[PDB]
């Protein structure tokens, strides 16, 4: 699809334009908080994190050309999604992954929640440094994004996606 263009190198990893204003990535690849990014200084944007999910909101659209997509909080187990892996070479691998159940993890010093998935099918699969690449699927007749890649199991086909879910309560003052 044209979409592959949304995926871009970022810090020590990758990230994704959900909308003109919204850029998501894996928190551990991101450059330190308050770094000048895409030629914007802090204050041009607002960053919300959620585990190892990291969302930048830009007051002014940074990618004006691009439509919004729906950003779900993970998806149902058994749904077949697809990871959009770009490699530094520019090579583009659509990896199919059947999504699984939730699962905690440690990124160093910090336990973080994710949805696991089991890569469907040699060379193949993921590497560290794919972190950030998105997981997306076709819900009925259109496409949504459900999380970002964080890591893959030493053993075989299992991968973890970080997810972002909207807050449901609020504290006062």
Swiss-Prot record:
- Which spans of this chain does the record mark as coiled coil? none
List, for all copies, the residue spans of the domain called Peptidase C37: 1-170
What positions constitute the catalytic site?
28 (for 3clpro activity), 52 (for 3clpro activity), 131 (for 3clpro activity)
Q: Which reaction equation describes what this protein catalyses?
A: Endopeptidase with a preference for cleavage when the P1 position is occupied by Glu-|-Xaa and the P1' position is occupied by Gly-|-Yaa
Q: Where in the cell is it found?
A: Host mitochondrion
What assembly does the database describe for this protein? Homodimer. Monomer; in solution.
**Function recorded in the entry:** Processes the polyprotein. 3CLpro-RdRp is first released by autocleavage, then all other proteins are cleaved. May cleave host polyadenylate-binding protein thereby inhibiting cellular translation. Does not cleave host G3BP1.
- This protein is called what? 3C-like protease
Q: Which organism is it from?
A: Norovirus (isolate Mouse/NoV/United States/MNV1/2002/GV)
Starting at the broadest rank, the lineage of the source organism is: Viruses, Riboviria, Orthornavirae, Pisuviricota, Pisoniviricetes
State the covered range within the intact protein: 997 to 1175 of 1687
